[PDB]
Symmetry: C6
Subunit: 56 residues, 6 copies
């Protein structure tokens, strides 16, 4: 049941999305399948399936 992604809550990370976009993202919440982020003044729900990797 363990996941490392939960430990990224509160960090500001780079999310490398599957299409080539990169989000500079403050992580505000993590669920089994989603990562909630703030990107500047935007709030996003990011699906983990759309992420390739995260630099932190």
């Amino acid at each position: 049941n363990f996941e490392y992604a939960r430990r990224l809550n509160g960090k500001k990370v780079k999310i490398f999305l599957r299409n080539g976009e990169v989000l500079d993202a403050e992580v505000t919440g993590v669920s089994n399948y989603e990562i909630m982020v703030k990107v500047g003044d935007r709030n996003l729900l990011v699906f983990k399936h759309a992420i390739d990797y995260i630099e932190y």
Copy 2:
């Protein structure tokens, strides 16, 4: 092992960024484990979550 944030989007205006590069300016009309129902203008869509990259809300 069950909680999801997407359920809280029900009833809200959102921007859905799809894996194909399309962007939907939508109102959410329902959310299930694997689907998000939306209105886009006059159109009614069932959107599979697997086809979504992210949602601005």
Copy 3:
């Protein structure tokens, strides 16, 4: 509510299925399982995997 899904509510309806490959199916839905949607497209019978669908207009 285990296994609630909106897709099976499209059973018996005329829909437009937008596939991940860019194709759009003008379809009549004849069955919906957990992972598949059965459709008629003109004279053709198709088994469509839900994972290959982006969205459905109805």
Copy 4:
């Protein structure tokens, strides 16, 4: 998830498998598991993963 798949109805049948890579397999189905479809394409035996299939015409 109940024990039902429409893909099982295609066992032993001639079908066209439309793959996510754009290929279309003219296939005879020789087995169906939860995640795979076993086929004969000409003289070739293939194990096809369902996740790689967009739809099947039958």
Copy 5:
């Protein structure tokens, strides 16, 4: 526990196969192990762990 139509990939263990990957790469491989989600192979001198989700089909 005896479910014939559960997983065919496990029967590939120890066999020569051609693996067609989702990006168009093709592996001329020998299977050295199979798990629920992975296939272990030798390709030439190289040892690879291949995720099944990255495989389109396998010729055997």
Copy 6:
């Protein structure tokens, strides 16, 4: 339950991602769905769904 990827913990491997990228990666942790790696001085969380294969 069993997975081979867990046995790569502590190894330096080449991770071939679905976008065509290769990571020269030291594996520092493995969960059901993630592989934690060091790539040079960068720390990454890599999702297994984004990996095609790993050379080890």
